[PDB]
Amino acid sequence: LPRDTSRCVGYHGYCIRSKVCPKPFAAFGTCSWRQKTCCVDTTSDFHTCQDKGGHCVSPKIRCLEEQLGLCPLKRWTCCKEI
- 29-36, Cβ contacts within 8 angstroms, sequence gap of 24 or more: 29/80, 29/81, 31/2, 31/4, 31/5, 31/7, 32/2, 32/3, 32/4, 32/5, 32/7, 32/8, 33/2, 36/2, 36/5
Cα dihedral sign, 34-4-25-45: negative
DSSP assignment string, the chain: --TTHHHHHHHT-EEESSS---TTEEEES-SSSTTSEEEEE-SSS--GGGGGT-EEE-TT--S-EEEEEE-SSSS-EEES--
Nearest to 54 by CA among 28, 27, 26, 80: 80
d(CA 15, CA 32): 9
